[PDB]
Design a protein around this nucleic acid. Structure first.
Ligand SMILES: *P(=O)(O)OCC(C)(C)[C@@H](O)C(=O)NCCC(=O)NCCS
Lengths: 49, 134, 72, 50, 50
DNA sequence: TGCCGTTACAATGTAACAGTGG
DNA sequence: CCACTGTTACATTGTAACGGCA
């Protein structure tokens, strides 16, 4: 059980790392989508005028 | 019933206890007259090496007021005899200065725990505080 | 020195004295300790040093010298 | 959930520790009695393996 | 294993009794027939000594 | 209830350590 | 040095009071 728990801890660490990677990806996507919304707004405005 | 009772052992215990009490001056027998008491004590003294007859001796001449004390003494003797086999089941006796004991007993009564449980909890909390700081 | 632990415990676990054990000999057959006795010896060594020894490492202590070799 | 199992492992470890002192003390006590009883007492008299 | 364990104590007590009985004699017994011839020799020695 | 384990004491005896002064 | 004293950490035995259980 000691070896099993240590190995499960290592597996847990690996999944935590990959989800940290996904969190970073989400932040980058958030920046990109902010830019996209700005572009949409711009376009809208342009259309109106 | 947790500890099995052995006759040739508990009877020797009872004989030794009664001889000790008699040597200490306790009135072993129910006979106020000194002659009958001495005769019964002599019967007991010569009765050594006998469980099946020391039990009968107790049933017949034992002082009524010592029955409870003898019973609880034998209970404690049995428990200690069975617990003294293994280290973890033994008990360690210490002496505590009166203020320290007073505070510890105050805590134990307050929390409803025994002295052992109270000290175990306190030591665990001390270790936890160490880890908190460390 | 610290080896005085091992060379003591071994004797206390096998009935031999401090000098009786020879580094060239083997516990399994040259000391008279059978499987159970050797298990007891290794487990007492584990207890003394407040450490752990898995089965695999533990099986390589059949010789006298090994008892210190893994220790020091 | 797994931290609870880690604590249970610590409990099992302390139980193992306790059993280990019991066993080592038993063997320490045994040593001397074997040494004395090897004066032909243990050959067949005491060791009533039955 | 449990069947053998149940059988064990009887066999062990038997072995101990037989070993004591044979060692008391100069001979070591190995068969029921052999015990019978030992009985015959015992009878011969008895009928002589008497 | 009466037995039975269990706790928390009390009283006394000892070994071991630390002090103190001759 | 050495002896005698003070102290701590036990052991050993006994007892009263709770609480569980038939
Ligand atoms: P040997 O006749 O002295 O018997 C030794 C033994 C089988 C009783 C036992 O102590 C032993 O040596 N077992 C080998 C190790 C083992 O089985 N480990 C199990 C770990 S879960």
């Amino acid at each position: 059980s000691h070896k099993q728990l240590a190995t499960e801890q290592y597996r847990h660490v690996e999944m935590a790392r990959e989800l940290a990677e996904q969190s970073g990806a989400s932040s980058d996507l958030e920046t990109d989508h902010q830019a996209a919304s700005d572009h949409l707004n711009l376009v809208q405005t342009a259309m109106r005028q | 019933m947790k500890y099995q009772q052995l006759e040739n052992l508990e009877c020797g215990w009872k004989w030794a206890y009664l001889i000790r009490k008699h040597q200490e001056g306790e009135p072993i027998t129910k006979y106020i007259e000194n002659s009958a008491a001495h005769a019964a004590v002599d019967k007991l003294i010569k009765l050594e090496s006998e469980p099946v007859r020391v039990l009968e001796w107790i049933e017949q001449h034992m002082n009524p007021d010592l029955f409870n004390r003898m019973k609880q003494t034998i209970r404690a003797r049995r428990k200690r005899h069975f617990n003294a086999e293994h280290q973890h089941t033994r008990k360690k006796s210490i002496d505590l200065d009166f203020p320290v004991w007073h505070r510890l007993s105050a805590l134990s009564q307050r929390r409803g725990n025994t002295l052992s449980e109270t000290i175990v909890q306190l030591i665990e909390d001390a270790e936890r505080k160490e880890k908190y700081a460390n | 020195t610290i080896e005085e632990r091992v060379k003591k415990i071994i004797g206390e676990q096998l009935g031999v004295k401090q000098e009786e054990v020879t580094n060239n000999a083997s516990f399994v057959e040259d000391l008279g300790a059978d499987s159970l006795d050797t298990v007891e010896l290794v487990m007492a060594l584990e207890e003394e040093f407040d450490t752990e020894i898995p089965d695999e490492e533990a099986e390589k202590i059949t010789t006298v010298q090994a008892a210190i070799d893994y220790i020091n | 959930e797994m931290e609870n199992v880690q604590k249970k492992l610590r409990k099992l470890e302390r139980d193992y520790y306790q059993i280990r002192e019991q066993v080592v003390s038993a063997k320490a006590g045994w040593c001397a009695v074997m040494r004395m009883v090897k004066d032909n007492g243990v050959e067949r008299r005491l060791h009533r393996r039955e | 294993i449990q069947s053998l364990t149940a059988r064990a104590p009887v066999w062990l007590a038997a072995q101990d009794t037989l070993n004591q009985l044979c060692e008391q004699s100069g001979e070591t017994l190995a068969s029921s027939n052999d015990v019978t011839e030992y009985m015959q020799q015992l009878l011969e020695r008895e009928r002589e000594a008497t």
